[PDB]
């Protein structure tokens, strides 16, 4: 199923009939960082499997719902169970949910993820406001927009120079200062590693040479689809480890360690993004 105008409209039609919510904000939460989705008011949960033309996710398994409702008086839509390209999903499957958000009226997309630290000033538990990216799949002919262009949504050759909105990064830093945890907030460049293997020690050393501050396996595909169709983005990474230090000390990383850091910061991140939603222009 192609992520074209007709197929996305069919999905959005079903969603409208069921929810009666017209959102202008969208949110995609990282693994272990989805608690805010349980605080949505007057909410409506829609499993992907019931939405026309939505991708099939049974092979991967686990939760997959679209959740609509109110937060801080604002109308939002959330992806509960996000799609990763290391699972084998195609460009079309990743893009369609984002283009459905567009047809529903979304103008701002907030994203969180877990990532490894490359910059030496980064430690486990820090936050990184993403200001740019290095898209290794894109350079290597696996860009999320490879294929026919869907002209109704955006141009053939999009410019990514302003994909990470400056004002939204400023508003997020301001809230960190009002609550006195700005010491945890950095900015940096995000490198996209297709995955699913964690970056090797020598791959981490390479990324340091190339000016990368963090590395992860998500986010960039959704950012490009949102920028293509004119949606503003804020993306924040939670640092689970510093891969450069681990390589120098012969220390390992694993998913169990990643999720422990997520649990330690989940509540502060929930509080942080709830206020962001409330304060959005």
């Amino acid at each position: 199923v192609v992520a074209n105008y007709e197929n996305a409209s069919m999905a959005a039609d079903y969603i409208k009939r069921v929810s009666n919510v017209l959102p202008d904000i969208g949110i995609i939460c990282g693994s272990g960082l989805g608690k805010l989705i349980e605080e949505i008011e007057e909410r409506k949960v829609i499993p992907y499997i019931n939405i026309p033309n939505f991708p099939k996710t049974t092979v991967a398994g686990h939760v997959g719902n679209l959740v609509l409702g109110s937060v801080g008086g604002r109308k939002i839509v959330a992806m509960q169970g996000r799609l990763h390209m290391y699972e084998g999903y195609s460009n079309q499957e990743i893009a369609l949910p984002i283009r459905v958000m567009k047809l529903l009226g979304v103008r701002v997309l907030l994203i969180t993820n877990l990532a490894g630290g490359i910059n030496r000033k980064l430690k486990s538990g820090d936050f990184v406001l993403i200001k740019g990216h290095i898209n290794f799949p894109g350079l290597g002919l696996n860009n999320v927009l490879v294929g026919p262009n869907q002209d109704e949504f955006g141009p053939r050759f999009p410019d990514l120079s302003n994909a990470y909105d400056r004002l939204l990064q400023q508003l997020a830093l301001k809230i960190a200062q009002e609550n006195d945890f700005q010491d945890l907030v950095h900015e940096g460049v995000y490198a996209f590693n297709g995955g699913p293997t964690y970056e090797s020690p020598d791959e981490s050393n390479m990324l340091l040479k190339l000016g990368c501050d963090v590395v992860g396996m998500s986010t960039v595909p959704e950012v490009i689809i949102a920028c293509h169709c004119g949606i503003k983005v804020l993306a924040v990474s939670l640092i689970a480890n510093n891969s450069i230090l681990d390589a120098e000390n012969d220390v390992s990383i694993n998913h169990e360690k990643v999720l422990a850091v997520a649990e330690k910061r989940a509540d502060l991140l929930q509080m942080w993004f709830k206020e962001i939603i409330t304060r959005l222009p």
Copy 2:
């Protein structure tokens, strides 16, 4: 349809029966740089859709013709409407037209493209004679030759050390001097970005670190297929902008700007390559 010996011979058979032209020179022109194709004498236009085994291009749309005729007394064949891998074409679809050129007797392939400037000595409107490349898709398992080797055309493991003929670069520079625009002519290394997104600001900073002089979304796949089957190549890039300066100044690039630069240089480039064809050994 595979780009094998049998399928390419079928296409070349049709072309011979229709044109009566046996060319030894081939040309692939960049976007907005195809005016010379309208100056071909005693010409014959063949739309791709009528040639057996030629790839289907209706989804992408726009012009797609093979044009044969005479220029400067030399017999040539031109691709009017070239195939880009960011459209979703397979390795086999990109390769077959080049291997048809081979069976028709082509020994020299001239190529032009539009690209972004990485080297700080490059400005909008300059020309770059390509002397080598960095093939990011090739490193990442999307090389144009991934698949079974077609032994009739070339070896399993080709050497690209002489893919960009030295003498042809010299002849092109000589003509620039005779007409006194050598101040516009550089040489440099071409980085292949799969696309279709323009290189991001931080991707441009990375390419500077790696020794790249220009970046574009084409050319390298055709060069590799031509080098595989023993065809000499000259490739020239037209610089539409300097991506490093744009990143430092927070300036954008877009297709509308690219085509404006193409229009400003199209006539000088036509004059330039017409003489090259006439002067080829």
Copy 3:
């Protein structure tokens, strides 16, 4: 055919019924480096085409056998005719033979390959004990584990920090010293170039900047599948040329030159790995 638990068990069942050998060591030999497979005692040769669920290799052609028997008193299994991803094989086809080795009881995998030299201290004919890698396909969304995870074999997000066993590198160096050819033995980082084109001169210059010591077109996919399911690996590269020197001198490389170096070192490498097998803990 997916490289899942059920399909791999079917293949291993056939192999058990035919050989009566239960190996705990596996070996994959590089091109021109397979002579040791002719020295296997009480051996049993099984062509891939007869083993259920094994990948089809007729298009590529050439030898493809699984060989079981005894070496130095140890029980081994060998892949005679290895699969390269530049031929067009899928992730599933590359992985299944390795996961069959696992179900047969393999705990150690020994691998040899031919590669180009990037580090300036490397010359034609040297050996390189691989201690890490840079996986360009993996960064670019062509990792061998892209797809659904086969939970019975390993985790979703494996850590590659210890994929190249330290003790095995030490044992291999020790044997080189006992026979007084340690002057040929280096250690270094292996860059994975998808291929099948040899690295271009400017790609070699890039890899030097990035800290790569050697470059080749194999090994990394098998290493990742073995590390995923808990198999220890030793990997050794034979250097056929120094790509940096060749680029500075405008010298070419080709397969004929590669195989000549392989012939010159094949007997010493056979002797070397026979003792390694005998001395494994």
